Amino acid sequence: VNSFSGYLKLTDNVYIKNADIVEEAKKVKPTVVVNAANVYLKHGGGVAGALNKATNNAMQVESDDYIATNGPLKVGGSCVLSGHNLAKHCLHVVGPNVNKGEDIQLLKSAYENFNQHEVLLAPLLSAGIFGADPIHSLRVCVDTVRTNVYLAVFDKNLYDKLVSSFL
Numbered sequence: 396v397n398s399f400s401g402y403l404k405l406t407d408n409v410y411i412k413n414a415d416i417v418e419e420a421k422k423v424k425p426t427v428v429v430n431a432a433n434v435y436l437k438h439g440g441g442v443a444g445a446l447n448k449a450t451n452n453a454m455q456v457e458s459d460d461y462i463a464t465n466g467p468l469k470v471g472g473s474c475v476l477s478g479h480n481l482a483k484h485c486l487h488v489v490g491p492n493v494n495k496g497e498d499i500q501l502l503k504s505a506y507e508n509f510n511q512h513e514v515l516l517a518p519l520l521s522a523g524i525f526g527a528d529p530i531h532s533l534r535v536c537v538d539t540v541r542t543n544v545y546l547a548v549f550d551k552n553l554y555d556k557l558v559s560s561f562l
């Protein structure tokens with residue numbers, strides 16, 4: 396039993412809710428919140444910009460030190476950093492950004508990072524400003540992640556379409 400509330404169960408291990416991931420993180424304080432990161436951990440907009448704003452920019456400060464030490468992530472890769480006031484940990488996962496021409500097949504590799512964590516609160520990777528089809532992202536999530544994933548979808552219209560079209 397965990398503290399996630401109001402989710403629709405899609406599969407044995409995948410759950411979905413219309414929710415603001417920031418507000419959901421602040422309420423659940425999950426062990427792991429997933430950020431929709433880029434390789435530079437520049438958290439300017441989308442989910443990343445919102446998560447970082449909720450940490451009063453502490454996420455960005457920590458991230459800049461990480462990059463200065465380690466260099467950029469790979470597309471499809473991840474790193475674990477602090478969850479600040481939102482979660483114990485933040486798993487920064489880089490899905491491909493279609494608006495940069497990145498290979499959509501890297502989306503499966505990105506979701507594989509979730510399997511290193513037993514339970515996660517997450518957005519749909521490569522959705523939103525990353526330019527992929529969120530229905531495709533949900534399909535890859537379900538077909539790749541084996542651990543327990545609680546997906547937060549900000550847009551109510553999108554949420555209804557994702558549920559109604561789910562096979």
Ligand SMILES: CC(=O)Nc1nc(C)c(S(=O)(=O)Nc2ccc(C)c(C#N)c2)s1
Pocket residue numbers: 414415416417431440441442445518519520521522523524525547548549550
């Ligand atoms: C303040 C605010 O926007 N909070 C949000 N929480 C969620 C779950 C969304 S989402 O449903 O649009 N998913 C989503 C997924 C991936 C990206 C890159 C983007 C972008 N950009 C968005 S937005």
